[PDB]
Design a protein around this ligand. Structure first.
Ligand SMILES: [Mg+2]
Lengths: 32, 62, 66, 52, 50, 467, 61
């Protein structure tokens, strides 16, 4: 399959982690 | 055992001149120690687990 | 008695085999047992502590967010 | 000798011996073929000794 | 011969056991000089004399 | 079999496959890789999804959440099950020889790559279900936009786990990632409950959940020390030190039996000395059996529920199982009141066991027998039976001293089949004994964590020894 | 738990004989372990139990 590094595997996960937090922050902020 | 089988097998081997490089290892092509009844039983345990969980979720979905 | 012995024998043999197997196992020694316990106990604590703390930090963040 | 082998086997493992056969190997060791009485199972005895 | 004395069979058995290669960890010993067993005997090339 | 593999080949071209580590990673770097990969996994398990509105729904799979390490109302709702179920059934097919994996690295790689393909598919199917069935709400009322974000969150979140697991297995980490995650939840579950600083507003008043912590507060408050200790030990609504004592008692029993092994003497067929040992561990089949037993237990419950809810008036249906969705005090739970499934269910406490002994007896007989049966058969599927092991040793030019190559199967047959069968009976017994004594969490989960830790320690020692 | 000659000096003949018997039984088990795949720890114990046997016999003599 597609060959990817280990840090990008690390990075994409952090990107997913931070992004969900942004949605939660955005969602609550807009709900105010 | 029929002694004529020596001749049949001997003649049959002599036919191998035409398929040099791809002679079949074994003429007696004709077993899973795992019994078919037990193999089906093992399937009923493992495969279904994903399927049933979906159905139970479906049951809780209505 | 045959049908009973047909069912009894595989059971009876299995118990005998189990006893036979256990006597042949190299059971851990007292020094071996203590050594393994310390390593497992440490790993149990290190791993739980990390999760414990990680869980404790999130609680306020989760409640504050939600 | 066979008598000594028989008595040692009985006392060491508390079993009963039917007969003993012996040979001296080409490497100089003596091998004993100890047969147990029909009421003892060598396979069971071998487990106790640790052979199996 | 198959007909053997105990003393002869005991002498032959000791000659059997000496006739092996050296262990290979002997090589790594600190002051070692031995490379191989220089006293190997072959039943056909050299005879025991008894 | 080749046709099935080939049809999967074109899809394996696009799948995200981690690159192998070219340079020999040092132990310090590997441990770091594990620690971060572990740390991230915890971060994901705690985070609730975005858009949830209801989470107090009852959990019929309350048991399975710990085993598969899934936290309800969080990104790890799916957990590793889309991988475990995949990993199980692939090995089942290959063990059944339905899919003949060649010794070629491509066929092995395609087999492994194929495993992932079904693994993510299960994730997609479950996640689509989890969204469609509306276990959080009503897709009409949440709105299509909300639904898709939950699905994509679930899909990649499961995706991240697979690569993280793949990263560890590919040498960047240590041991097996799947094992690490499952053991991770178990220890945190045990440790958190003992030291939870959360308190519960019971009708009597505010009460600490922590078994250790609650004792301190009660001792620091209740003048009657005996009353405090007695109260802190039998909080039937909260974890108690009595359970903590039981959990530790299990911890010792499992260690002692984890070290059991039969050491067969072997050597190299080419060189003198070099005497080595092939170990046959008592838990030959490892934690796999009891996992199968629970599923077969779960499968019967589903079939019993579906038939009962439609034809409860049929005698056969009643014998199969009868359910009552008792909802007294806590969340609604479907319990088996009558039929075969009832006896197949685990009695909660010793008192319940003593009340109806036959319920435990039938439960004991089946659980032990099933665990032994699953282990005994998994050998011929796992590709680790006597004939298989003998084949591996012959390839490695190993042999038993004094034996011909062909008599090693017989020697291995003495211990392998018996270890597998007895291995299941012991692991099945330990789960029963832990639950009966009331271990914190679950004996199965307890067994998994300790077993994994030792295996993770085993590589730890081997890697540490080299340095 | 090691056997030292100083410990055995005051012991009666019967205790030393019994102590000797335990060592001899232990050695026999070890020689079984030597051929049935015992651990390196068990192999190393052979020399320790042999010299322990020599110590007891030395004190008896
Ligand atoms: Mg000549």
């Amino acid at each position: 399959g597609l060959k990817v590094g280990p840090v990008p595997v690390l990075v994409m996960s952090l990107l997913f982690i931070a992004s969900v937090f942004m949605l939660h922050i955005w969602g609550k902020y807009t709900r105010s | 055992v029929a002694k004529q089988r020596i001749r049949m097998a001997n003649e049959k081997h002599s036919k191998n001149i035409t398929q040099r490089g791809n002679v079949a290892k074994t003429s007696r092509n004709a077993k899973a120690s795992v019994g078919p009844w037990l193999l089906a039983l093992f399937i009923f345990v493992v495969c279904g687990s994903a399927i049933f969980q979906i159905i139970q979720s479906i049951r809780m979905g209505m | 008695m045959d049908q009973v012995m047909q069912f009894v024998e595989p059971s009876r043999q299995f118990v005998k085999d189990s006893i036979r197997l256990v006597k042949r196992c190299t059971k851990p020694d007292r020094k071996e047992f203590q050594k393994i316990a310390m390593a497992t106990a440490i790993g149990f604590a290190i791993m739980g502590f990390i999760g414990f703390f990680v869980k404790l930090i999130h609680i306020p963040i989760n409640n504050i967010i939600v | 000798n066979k008598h000594q082998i028989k008595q040692a086997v009985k006392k060491l493992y508390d079993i009963d011996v039917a007969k003993v056969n012996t040979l001296i190997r080409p490497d100089g060791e003596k091998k004993a073929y100890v047969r147990l009485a029909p009421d003892y199972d060598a396979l069971d005895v071998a487990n106790k000794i640790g052979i199996i | 011969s198959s007909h053997k004395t105990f003393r002869i069979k005991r002498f032959l058995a000791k000659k059997q056991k000496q006739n092996r290669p050296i262990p290979q960890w002997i090589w790594m010993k600190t002051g070692n000089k031995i490379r191989y067993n220089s006293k190997r005997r072959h039943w056909r090339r050299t005879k025991l004399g008894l | 079999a080749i046709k099935f593999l080939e049809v999967i080949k074109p899809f394996c071209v696009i799948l995200p496959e981690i690159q192998k580590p070219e340079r020999k990673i040092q132990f310090k770097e590997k441990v770091l890789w594990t620690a971060i990969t572990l740390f991230i996994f915890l971060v994901c398990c705690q985070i609730p999804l975005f858009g949830i509105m209801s989470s107090d729904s009852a959990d019929p799979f309350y048991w399975m959440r710990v085993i598969l390490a899934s936290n309800r109302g969080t990104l790890m709702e799916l957990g590793i099950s889309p991988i475990v179920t995949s990993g199980l059934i692939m090995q089942l097919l290959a063990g059944a020889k339905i899919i003949e994996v060649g010794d070629t690295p491509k066929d092995r790689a395609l087999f492994n790559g194929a495993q992932k393909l079904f693994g993510m598919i299960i994730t997609i199917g479950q996640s689509i279900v989890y969204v469609m069935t509306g276990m959080y709400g009503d897709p009409s009322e949440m709105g299509a936009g909300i639904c898709l974000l939950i699905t994509i969150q679930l899909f990649v979140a499961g995706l991240i786990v697979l690569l993280l697991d793949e990263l560890l297995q590919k040498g960047y980490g240590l041991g097996s990632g799947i094992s690490l995650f499952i053991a991770t939840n178990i220890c945190e579950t045990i440790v958190w409950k003992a030291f939870s600083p959360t308190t519960v507003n019971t009708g009597r008043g505010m009460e600490f959940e922590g078994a250790i912590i609650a004792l301190f507060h009660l001792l620091a408050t209740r003048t009657d020390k005996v009353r405090a200790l007695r109260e802190a030990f039998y909080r039937q609504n909260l974890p108690n030190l009595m359970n903590l004592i039981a959990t530790i008692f299990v911890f010792a029993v499992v260690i002692y039996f984890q070290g059991f092994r039969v050491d067969l003497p072997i050597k190299s067929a080419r060189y003198r000395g070099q005497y080595n040992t092939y170990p046959i561990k008592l838990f030959y089949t490892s934690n796999i059996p009891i996992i199968l037993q629970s599923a077969l237990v779960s499968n019967l419950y589903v079939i019993s529920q579906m038939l009962s809810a439609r034809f409860s008036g049929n005698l056969l249906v009643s014998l199969l199982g009868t359910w009552s969705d008792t909802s007294s005090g806590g969340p609604a739970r479907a319990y088996p009141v009558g039929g075969l499934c009832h006896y197949l269910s685990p009695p909660e406490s010793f008192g319940s066991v003593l009340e109806d002994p036959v319920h435990a007896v039938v439960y004991i007989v089946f659980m032990l027998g099933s665990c032994a049966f699953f282990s005994k058969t998994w050998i011929e599927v796992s590709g680790s039976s006597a004939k298989d092991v003998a084949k591996q040793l012959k390839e490695q030019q190993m042999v038993m001293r004094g034996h011909r190559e062909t008599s090693m199967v017989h020697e291995l047959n003495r211990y392998i089949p018996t270890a597998a069968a007895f291995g299941g009976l012991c692991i099945g017994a330990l789960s029963v004994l832990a639950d009966f004594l009331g271990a914190i969490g679950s004996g199965t989960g307890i067994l998994l964590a300790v077993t994994i830790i030792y295996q993770y320690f085993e590589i730890f020692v081997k890697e540490q020894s080299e340095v | 738990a090691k056997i030292k000659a100083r410990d055995l000096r005051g012991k009666k003949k019967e205790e030393l004989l019994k102590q000797l018997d335990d060592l001899k039984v232990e050695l026999s088990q070890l020689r079984v372990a030597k051929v049935t795949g015992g651990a390196a720890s068990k192999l190393s114990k052979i020399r320790v139990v042999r010299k322990s046997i020599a110590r007891v016999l030395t004190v008896i003599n």
